[PDB]
Amino acid sequence: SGMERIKELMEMVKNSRMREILTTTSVDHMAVIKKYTSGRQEKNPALRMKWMMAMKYPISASSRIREMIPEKDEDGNTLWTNTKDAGSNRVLVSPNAVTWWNRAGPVSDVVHYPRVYKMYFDRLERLTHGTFGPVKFYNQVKVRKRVDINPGHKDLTSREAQEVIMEVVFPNEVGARTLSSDAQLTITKEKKEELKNCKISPIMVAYMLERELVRRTRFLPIAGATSSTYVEVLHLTQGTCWEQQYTPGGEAENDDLDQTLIIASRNIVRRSIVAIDPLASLLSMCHTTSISSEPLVEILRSNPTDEQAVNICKAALGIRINNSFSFGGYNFKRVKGSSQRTEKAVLTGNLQTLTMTIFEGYEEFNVSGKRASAVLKKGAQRLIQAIIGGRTLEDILNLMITLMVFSQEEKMLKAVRGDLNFVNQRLNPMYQLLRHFQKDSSTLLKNWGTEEIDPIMGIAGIMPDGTINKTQTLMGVRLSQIRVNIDKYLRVRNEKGELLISPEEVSEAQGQEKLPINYNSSLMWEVNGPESILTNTYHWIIKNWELLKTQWMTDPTVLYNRIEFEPFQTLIPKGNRAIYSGFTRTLFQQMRDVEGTFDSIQIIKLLPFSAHPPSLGRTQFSSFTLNIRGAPLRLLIRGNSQVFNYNQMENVIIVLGKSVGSPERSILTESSSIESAVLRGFLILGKANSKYGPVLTIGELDKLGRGEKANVLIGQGDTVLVMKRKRDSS
Amino acid sequence: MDVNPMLIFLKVPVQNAISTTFPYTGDPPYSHGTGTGYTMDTVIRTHDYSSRGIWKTNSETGAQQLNPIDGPLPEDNEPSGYAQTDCVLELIEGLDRSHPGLFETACQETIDAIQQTRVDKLTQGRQTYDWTLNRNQPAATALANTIEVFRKNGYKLNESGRLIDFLKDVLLSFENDSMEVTTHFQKKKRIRDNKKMITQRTIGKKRVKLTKKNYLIRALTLNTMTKDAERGKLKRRAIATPGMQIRGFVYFVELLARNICERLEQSGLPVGGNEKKAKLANVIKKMMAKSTDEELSYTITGDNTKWNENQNPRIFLAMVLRITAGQPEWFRDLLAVAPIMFSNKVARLGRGYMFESKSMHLRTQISAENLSDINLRYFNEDTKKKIEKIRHLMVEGTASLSPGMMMGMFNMLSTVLGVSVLNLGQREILKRTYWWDGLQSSDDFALIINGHFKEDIQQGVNHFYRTCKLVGINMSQKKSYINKTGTFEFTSFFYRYGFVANFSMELPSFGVAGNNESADMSIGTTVIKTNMINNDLGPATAQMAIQLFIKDYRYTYRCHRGDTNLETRRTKSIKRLWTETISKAGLLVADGGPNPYNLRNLHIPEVCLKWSLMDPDYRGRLCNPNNPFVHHMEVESTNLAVVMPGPAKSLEYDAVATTHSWTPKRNRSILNTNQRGILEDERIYQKCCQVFEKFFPSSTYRRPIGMASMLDAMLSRARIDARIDLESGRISSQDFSEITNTCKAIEALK
Amino acid sequence: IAWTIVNSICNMTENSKPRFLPDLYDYKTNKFIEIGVTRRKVEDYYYEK
RNA sequence: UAUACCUCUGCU
RNA sequence: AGUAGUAACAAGAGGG
Ligand SMILES: [Zn+2]
């Protein structure tokens, strides 16, 4: 009706106080006077509530409570009083009033409240339909990372979400702005229809939508799956020493599934290379591995991800590599190289910044479409060469224009004149440049540039004007009229026998999985990732130390070639593995040959680096490098470091912050002034004695003759006396 | 056997059993009485650290202002505030070099804020000193009072609504030499009652004009009080509260420093605990990667002593001007305001003192203003001596305090000074045998020094230490210490080859928050949940923390389970609810229902968790949108509570609005005082805002914008809504005339 | 307030919403009006807007 | 001056 | 007395 609101305003304007405030204070100033109050923000709410809950009438409530509930209930408890709450027309009330309402108060329809509070009820829906696995116990390494805390967010900005909220609950008071995106329009239709005829405060609906729609993040320590629905249940899935396996209800998004499939395949390929029979090991892991509880093989059968490690897994199982795609009505089919993705913004000729998913690396395509085909050679923003043929000159030229745009050269970007706008399904930004240049390509060809070529029979050039020239042509363009196989060592080749995919050329960038990976494999350790490989490997040596120490003494070649050291080898750089093994084994035999000198910790520390065919090189090392989550870490040869830290106080070997086990208490009282197993063909003796000359670096050790003593900067600010031993080790 | 808990440290490392050294289950220290003793201490101590500087009487206030900067370089390790302008600018330039375009973007982001920011933004904030009343008031109340007195005088640029205009009015208001203010006072009337005449206390208001000094002193005044509930300290200390004039300028200066600190890896501010730890982990990773195997590494666990007392407003003016170099001069001079007012700041001396006569058995209160004109026979020896020193700085009941700072005044720009010292330690700047990096938030810092030998570290410490002394930063020699990189401490985070837990830090947050039944249940379960994630609260202890929370919640709110044999004021009405309810499991805990929570549940709100198990009528009553218990606040303040760990940030919680989302009664002590009338002002303001929302529902979500009147806006809406209701809808022709005649009638009454 | 008057009309009668502020609106024909009279004759300001 | 009462307040 | 601890509480204000 709107009758009683204007009637009350007249009654308020009749009051000479209220008419002054209503006239004097502006709309902008009303926000200030709304928050005008005597009331402090409570310093100690926990104390005050305990103080106040002893009182008869601690709760304030609207005066209309006196008309709704009785003054006294059935047991004679006073429910409300007439005392006004300081600074308002609200009255002081007993907690018995709240109880009386909940048992005998007016009932209302609230059945569609789960649509208003959808963000909350979705959490219960995921938990109710969740599936628990077993609890494994191990040292859980947690990377502090920014992650989403709001699953099922329809991703918009704060201002975009404000417009949507306004449209749903305050449709009449929408400002000058309107619904821009098709996301905004479709969300508004759904919200309007879901929330229709739902008796609840619009303030609360506006609030719940603001929380639901807008993306929010937090820095949290996460082990394993980082996606929203797994971040939701970190308290439940991880502790200090345990992993409660759990799949939330609902289906995983393809984005999360493609990202984690790539990580799973990469880890599988990196593991297989350092084994004796890679293809059998890769196949063994493929059939045992699952992602989000779904087995890895059926994912590889249905998922079209194009990535070198995934394709090696697809090739080993005999599954078609997603080798092809379409663009401008031509089927591109890659015959050599690989696609590496990098989204970046670049300026056009019209100074328009646009985010392009630009491709990098050397690639080769056999392209073919309607009435014309080509053989493209491409680099990062480069058309290396395109040999094109077809039934008509226009068909060739139409394909040529498509390739020139597909190359992503700086030539063609700078040759764009005007703004790029096409359709109301809007296409991706590659088609914006294509459709621009398909209509008019006058500036493209002028700015592309010409090159001179040698007159070859069968080949001819295409000029900017459209003429066929024999000895001149546009940069890169020439005009002229698939099974796979995988060997024991995971090299993918074609029918001709040329290299398509290499395990060595798989990307070494790890990154943390979005969905949980479980390799149910004896080739892998219990937990995923590289910190786990370090900790489990060093834990295993300590646990089986008595067996491996005597195996070190008697038959070391069987110790070094233990299969439990293979995961450790993935963390070592490919090139370094041999020389590291050469260095380690030389250092170990020095400990055997130089009797008296025996360090259990030094053996345990360096033992995993043995597991590779050793090199005969004579380089010195103050550390071995280890690749852990992208960054290189340096395990030092002499003493403790971040990667390996023997703590005498605890009697514990700490590997990257986590205790890996106590070694024997014997090893506390186990030392000798002379330290073998530090430098190849040398022996550390004791403190730096200046009688034997000035300090030499480790690279300068070749100067010293057989049996000559000298002072050396060995590492960690220590200067130490060293002698060159006469007879060298095996 | 004598039991000794600390002998656990023989086997367990200190960091791994660090909870046993945090006694946070007991009540923390509280100040009783006044903080005048502490405010005088701070003022006296601050001037002693700057004592070799230059004194000058101020042209406007007449206050005796000590300038220590560019003063004699210190000759001992005692706390000094002899910062050197040239050395500060070198460090701030060194920051600009290392982060090109940072100062550009930070300024440009601050300029965009200055243009968009409304006067409304100063309503959001903690207690502020009201010059109008010479006391602390809420932020919005002190703003409205300052706008009202500005409007009564010739200052209405803020009428527009943009904040920069209010800031002009503040600078223009110093020119007035007769600023009018309405002080309130009590009167004792007599009125007849049927047949005896009783005395009646009433409150009138008296217009008083102020001197040009009087207003100026009050605008530069910052209030003081003792800081309560502070852990880890034997003695109390004074905290400070900014006034309404300086507040708005401080907002924009801190907003610049925030944008600077947001893009500095070496800043701990303004990021949270986990991100702070990640930042410390990155610099250790960065220091180890950049170094060689020959080099050493030591970490200083660092505290700066007398941090605020030795940071200088004149130095902040040097920073603000250097950070804003090349920007519009209006923007540079706007941000320069806050440092200027801080350089000419004066400190209120608090409540004063209480005296006591044992023989006569009487007590009395003297104000801090009386400390000038009063005999010193009353006071003890230490207190006397402080009053004698404070008289030399006393100006119209407030001690002058040109140098230094005080807690609660100013936030993030002081960290940028510290970060610039950390940034100096790059290898390419120092070009010698040592080099450093680290993290810093306020006085607390973690410095990592690398070098080739142990003596290189000693030279690097001294180089860092003395460079800090050159800009008035004093590293504590007694509280700081050094060791090889591997362990350190930082804002009570403990690193031992990786961060370990400090659960006992968080023990005060385990309990009933005391907001209301709805909010506390959500807050309690989330506290348990977040501590499982962030502070290694194990699963068994977490279960027991749920069990103990329900106990505390049941006793506090008197809402024990409906089948209990207890007797309280609430047991009977909850018993009636219990018996009538079919599905008992649906009842909330506040309605005598069972605890649904275990580990897996903690993130689901209680109403949401019990919804499917509720009786329809109970659920219909519980969540009834037309119930008198809820206070329908704005969207910005929906499901928010206040918590202290930092200063005091808001805590958002997940909860369904029910009859349990109630608000406890207001404090009523104002009824006895001369400010009794503020309650009626508030009552009238709320009724006006309540009626406006019936014409503008959107105002509760997004704050409306207009220079037009509230009445004229409501009138405009009354006509056009009534138009649409008749032109296409459900309303009669006679009703349209009845509404428009009322709008004509309302327009007739001005 | 000006846009609230514009949007209240468009909600009940499903019509288009303009970008910039109109000056008048006829209720018979259901058409918005934008005034822009000046010292120029007709064509210089008609075809520009 | 005392002794009874009565009113307001319990973070202001 | 007792709490307490760098200063307070051990009721304050009013019916004058
Ligand atoms: Zn109980």
Distance between the alpha carbon (CA) of B363 and the C1' atom of E1, Å: 18
Neighbouring C-beta atoms of residue C30, cutoff 10 Å: 10
**A459: helix, strand or coil:** strand
Choose the closest CB to C8 out of B706, B713, B724: B724
Residues A136 and A245 sit within 8 Å (Cβ to Cβ): yes
**B608: helix, strand or coil:** helix
Q: Which amino acid is residue A461, in one-letter code?
A: G
Strand ranges in B304-397 using DSSP code E only, listed in sequence order: 346-348, 353-357, 362-366
A503: which 2 tokens?
């395990």
Q: What is the DSSP annotation of A679-721?
A: STTEEEEEE--GGG-S-B-SGGGGGS-TT-EEEEEEETTEEEE
Helices (H) and strands (E) in chain A, counts: 27, 33
B305: which 2 tokens?
């002593």
DSSP code for B304:
B
Q: What is the DSSP annotation of B421-488?
A: HHHHT-HHHH-SSEEEEEEEETTEEEEEEEESSHHHHHHHHHHHHHHHHHTT--B-TTT-EEEETTEE
**B45: helix, strand or coil:** helix
Give CA B706 to chain center in angstroms: 30
Question: Residue A94 contacts by C-beta under 8 Å, 6 or more apart in sequence?
Answer: A56, A57, A58, A59, A77, A78, A79, A80, B569
**Resolution for this model in angstroms, one decimal place?**
2.8
Helices (H) and strands (E) in chain B, counts: 24, 21
Query: Torsion angle of alpha carbons B439, B444, B446, B449, nearest 10°?
Result: 100
Residues A712 and A701 sit within 8 Å (Cβ to Cβ): yes
> What is d(CA A257, CA A516) in angstroms, rounded to the nearest whole number?
10
B510: which 2 tokens?
């385990």
Share of chain B residues as helix, strand and coil, in percent rounded to the nearest 5: 45, 15, 40
**B167: helix, strand or coil:** helix
Choose the closest CB to A175 out of C3, C8, C11: C3
Residues A285 and A161 sit within 8 Å (Cβ to Cβ): no
B557: which 2 tokens?
């709110």
Q: What is the DSSP annotation of A166-215?
A: HHHH-GGG--S----SHHHHHHHHHHHHHSTT--S-HHHHHHHHHHHHS-
Nearest to A221 by CA among A531, A681, A11: A531
C-alpha angle with apex A501: A500 to A504, nearest 5 degrees? 140
Residues B342 and B410 sit within 8 Å (Cβ to Cβ): yes
Q: What is the DSSP annotation of A351-412?
A: --EEEEEEEES-EEEEEE-SSEEEEEEEETTEEEEEEEEESSHHHHHHHHHHHHHHTT-HHH
What length is written for chain A?
730
B143: which 2 tokens?
């703003």
B748: which 2 tokens?
């007739």
Question: Residue A645 contacts by C-beta under 8 Å, 6 or more apart in sequence?
Answer: A653, A654, A655, B486, B497
Q: Which amino acid is residue B83, in one-letter code?
A: A
Look at strands A718-724 and C24-26 and give their pairing. unpaired
A721 φ, ψ (degrees, to nearest 5): -80, 130
> What is d(CA B417, CA B411) in angstroms, rounded to the nearest whole number?
12
Nearest to B82 by CA among B51, B41, B43: B51
Nearest to B645 by CA among B538, B533, B532, B493: B493
Burial of residue A463 (CB within 10 Å: 0-12, 13-18, 19+) is middle
B365 φ, ψ (degrees, to nearest 5): -110, 120
Contacts of C7 in chain A (CB under 8 A): 171-174
> What is d(CA B615, CA A521) in angstroms, rounded to the nearest whole number?
50
Cα–Cα distances (Å) from A144 to A141, A220, B57, in that order, read: 10, 5, 54
b/e map of B662-683 (b: 16 or more CB within 10 Å)? bbbbbeeebeeeebbebbebbb
Cα–Cα distances (Å) from B523 to B517, B526, B733, in that order, read: 10, 5, 53
> What is d(CA A130, CA A128) in angstroms, rounded to the nearest whole number?
6
Give CA B83 to chain center in angstroms: 28
Centre of ligand 1 to C-alpha B555, Å, is: 7
Question: Residue B378 contacts by C-beta under 8 Å, 6 or more apart in sequence?
Answer: B353, B355
Q: What is the DSSP annotation of A577-646?
A: HHHHHHHHHHHHHHHHHSTT---HHHHHHHGGGG-SPPP------SEEEEEETTEEEEEESSS--SS-EE
Give the bridge partners for A331, in sequence order: A326, A368
Residue with tokens 């070859």, as numbered in its chain: A456
Distance between the alpha carbon (CA) of B688 and the C1' atom of E4, Å: 49
Residues A33 and B638 sit within 8 Å (Cβ to Cβ): no
Residues A395 and A372 sit within 8 Å (Cβ to Cβ): yes
> What is d(CA B735, CA B728) in angstroms, rounded to the nearest whole number?
14
> What is d(CA B634, CA A504) in angstroms, rounded to the nearest whole number?
60
Cα–Cα distances (Å) from B212 to A187, A333, B244, B613, in that order, read: 59, 84, 18, 69
b/e map of B314-343 (b: 16 or more CB within 10 Å)? bbbbbbbbbbbeebeeebbebbbbbbbbbb
Range of the domain at A241: 1-250
Residue with tokens 């200090």, as numbered in its chain: A240
- Omega within 30 of 0 (cis) for the link into B664: no
Give the bridge partners for A504, in sequence order: none
> What is d(CA B731, CA B722) in angstroms, rounded to the nearest whole number?
8
Residues A68 and A105 sit within 8 Å (Cβ to Cβ): yes
A171: which 2 tokens?
């449709």
Centre of ligand 1 to C-alpha B567, Å, is: 12
**B625: helix, strand or coil:** coil
Q: Distance from first CA to last CA of chain A, Å, rounded?
A: 101
> What is d(CA A172, CA B717) in angstroms, rounded to the nearest whole number?
11
Q: Which amino acid is residue A302, in one-letter code?
A: S
> What is d(CA A541, CA A603) in angstroms, rounded to the nearest whole number?
10
Neighbouring C-beta atoms of residue B86, cutoff 10 Å: 10
A350: which 2 tokens?
């019209």
> What is d(CA B130, CA B132) in angstroms, rounded to the nearest whole number?
5
Contacts of B724 in chain C (CB under 8 A): 8-9, 11-12
b/e map of B414-440 (b: 16 or more CB within 10 Å)? bbbbbbbbbbbbbeeeeeeebbbbbbb
Which stretches of A70-117 are DSSP H helices?
95-104, 113-116
Give the bridge partners for A368, in sequence order: A331, A373
Nearest to A354 by CA among A406, A432, A417: A432
Q: Which amino acid is residue A520, in one-letter code?
A: N
Cα–Cα distances (Å) from A365 to A323, A357, A647, in that order, read: 10, 18, 57
> What is d(CA B587, CA B583) in angstroms, rounded to the nearest whole number?
8
**A421: helix, strand or coil:** coil
Residues B30 and B228 sit within 8 Å (Cβ to Cβ): yes
Cα–Cα distances (Å) from B60 to A306, B169, B244, in that order, read: 75, 18, 19
Neighbouring C-beta atoms of residue A376, cutoff 10 Å: 25
Instruction: State the helix-helix crossing angle for A95-104 and B571-580, rounded to 10 degrees.
Output: 10
Look at strands B346-348 and B221-226 and give their pairing. parallel
> What is d(CA A451, CA A464) in angstroms, rounded to the nearest whole number?
11
Q: Which amino acid is residue A710, in one-letter code?
A: A
Burial of residue B484 (CB within 10 Å: 0-12, 13-18, 19+) is middle
Strand D bases, protein C-beta under 7 A = 8-12
Burial of residue A67 (CB within 10 Å: 0-12, 13-18, 19+) is exposed
> What is d(CA B33, CA B236) in angstroms, rounded to the nearest whole number?
12
Instruction: State the helix-helix crossing angle for B244-262 and B313-323, rounded to 10 degrees.
Output: 50
Chain B residues 641-670, Cβ below 7 A from strand D: 666-670
- Tell me chain B's radius of gyration from C-alpha atoms: 30
> What is d(CA B435, CA B426) in angstroms, rounded to the nearest whole number?
6
Nearest to A268 by CA among A245, A293, A296: A296
Question: Residue A650 contacts by C-beta under 8 Å, 6 or more apart in sequence?
Answer: A659, A662, B13
**C5: helix, strand or coil:** helix
> What is d(CA B617, CA C15) in angstroms, rounded to the nearest whole number?
43
b/e map of B498-514 (b: 16 or more CB within 10 Å)? ebbbbbbbbebbbbbbb
Contacts of C22 in chain A (CB under 8 A): none
Interchain pair C1, B713: CB under 8 A: yes
What length is written for chain C?
49
Q: Which amino acid is residue A474, in one-letter code?
A: L
Query: Torsion angle of alpha carbons B526, B527, B529, B535, nearest 10°?
Result: 150
Residues with CB under 7 A from strand E: B 29-38, 188, 198-199, 201, 234-236, 351-354, 356, 363, 382-383, 672
**A546: helix, strand or coil:** helix
> What is d(CA B408, CA B242) in angstroms, rounded to the nearest whole number?
8
Neighbouring C-beta atoms of residue A712, cutoff 10 Å: 22
Distance between the alpha carbon (CA) of B672 and the C1' atom of E13, Å: 7
Question: What is the longest distance spanned by two Cα atoms in chain B?
Answer: 101
Nearest to B332 by CA among B340, B342, B320: B320
- Omega within 30 of 0 (cis) for the link into B270: yes
Residues A68 and B621 sit within 8 Å (Cβ to Cβ): no
Residues A21 and A13 sit within 8 Å (Cβ to Cβ): no
Choose the closest CB to B621 out of A25, A53, A107: A107
Instruction: State the helix-helix crossing angle for A16-24 and A3-14, rounded to 10 degrees.
Output: 110
Tally of CA atoms within 13 A in the half-sphere of A438 that contains its CB: 16
Residues A23 and B709 sit within 8 Å (Cβ to Cβ): yes
B232: alpha, beta or left? (left if phi > 0; alpha if psi -120 to 50): left
> What is d(CA A680, CA B536) in angstroms, rounded to the nearest whole number?
45
> What is d(CA A462, CA A454) in angstroms, rounded to the nearest whole number?
14
Q: Which amino acid is residue B216, in one-letter code?
A: L
A140: which 2 tokens?
């859980």
**B696: helix, strand or coil:** coil
Interchain pair B745, A10: CB under 8 A: yes
Interchain pair C11, A171: CB under 8 A: yes
> What is d(CA A23, CA B232) in angstroms, rounded to the nearest whole number?
54
Residues A174 and C7 sit within 8 Å (Cβ to Cβ): yes
Neighbouring C-beta atoms of residue B712, cutoff 10 Å: 17
Four-residue CA torsion sign, A407, A413, A414, A417: positive
Residues B606 and B522 sit within 8 Å (Cβ to Cβ): yes
Containing B663, the helix (H) or strand (E) segment is strand B663-664
A310: which 2 tokens?
């995934």
Neighbouring C-beta atoms of residue B492, cutoff 10 Å: 14
Nearest to B550 by CA among B605, B596, B504: B596
Give CA B101 to chain center in angstroms: 31
In chain C, the residue whose alpha carbon lies closest to the alpha carbon of B726 is C12
Residues A102 and B621 sit within 8 Å (Cβ to Cβ): yes
A315: which 2 tokens?
């090739």
Q: What is the DSSP annotation of A134-166?
A: EEEES----EEEEEE--TT-----HHHHHHHHH
DSSP code for B667:
P
What length is written for chain B?
750
**B289: helix, strand or coil:** helix
Give the bridge partners for A723, in sequence order: A683, A709
DSSP code for B227:
P
B348: which 2 tokens?
């209120």
Look at strands A459-462 and A340-347 and give their pairing. unpaired
